[PDB]
């Protein structure tokens, strides 16, 4: 209920205050060359970020009105998309590079995915994506992840976030034509984020089968949700 009553400015304030910290990796620094020391680094990072993500999702207006089952489903579906959009946002300022962590700045079968992530960061930089827009998109990713009075509730919350995006655009002086165009541009990037998560999830499953890189029980359980 309360999430359907927030003003656009209050929605934005809530999401901004909910933002997780940027965590550090175990990258050593060079001095070891990469192997799947790299995958080791990314999966350790993801595992620590996940605990912050779960506590962030609880602060997304509307999320805690869902059943525990539905809350679980949305995070199982959305987690890699959410990590990825975070990465892309952090990397905006670093052309041609992905700032996985402050200490772990990687440049360019992981190359296809790196290239996709780099392209997304480049798109966001081109569009001058704002932090207020970013936090709305990340909440959309959570609530839209992927595929019914409670469906109505998710839809009402999604409409409110859309309203909040448009509010931000109107505030920034965009014409109505420009607002609608920018809204569409941003939401179409979510298709690409979905794409990259799907590709990433197949790599993670492959990693699981190889048994070389250590994967946390939580990561194993997240991965298992994407297969059955």
């Amino acid at each position: 209920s309360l999430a359907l009553s927030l003003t656009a400015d209050q929605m934005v304030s809530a999401l901004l205050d909910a933002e997780p910290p940027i965590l550090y990796s175990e990258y050593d620094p060079t001095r070891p060359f990469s192997e799947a020391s790299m995958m080791g680094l990314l999966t350790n990072l993801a595992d620590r970020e996940l605990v912050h993500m779960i506590n962030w999702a609880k602060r997304v207006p509307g999320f805690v009105d869902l059943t525990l089952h539905d809350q679980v489903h949305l995070l199982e579906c959305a987690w890699l998309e959410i990590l990825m959009i975070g990465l892309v946002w952090r990397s905006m300022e670093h052309p041609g590079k992905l700032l996985f962590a402050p200490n772990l700045l990687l440049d360019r079968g992981m190359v296809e995915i790196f290239d996709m992530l780099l392209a997304t960061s480049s798109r966001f930089r081109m569009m001058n994506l704002q932090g207020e827009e970013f936090v709305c998109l990340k909440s959309i990713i959570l609530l839209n992840s992927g595929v019914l009075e409670e469906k109505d509730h998710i839809h009402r919350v999604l409409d409110k976030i859309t309203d909040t995006l448009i509010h931000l655009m109107a505030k920034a002086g965009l014409t109505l034509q420009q607002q609608h165009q920018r809204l569409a541009q941003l939401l179409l990037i979510l298709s690409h984020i979905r794409h990259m998560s799907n590709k990433g999830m197949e790599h993670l499953y492959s990693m699981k089968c190889k048994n070389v890189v250590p994967l946390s029980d939580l990561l194993l359980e997240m991965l298992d949700a994407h297969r059955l």
Partner: peptide, 9 residues
């Protein structure tokens, strides 16, 4: 798939 459930609680 119980870890996430525990963490959400």
């Amino acid at each position: 798939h119980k870890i996430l459930h525990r963490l959400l609680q």
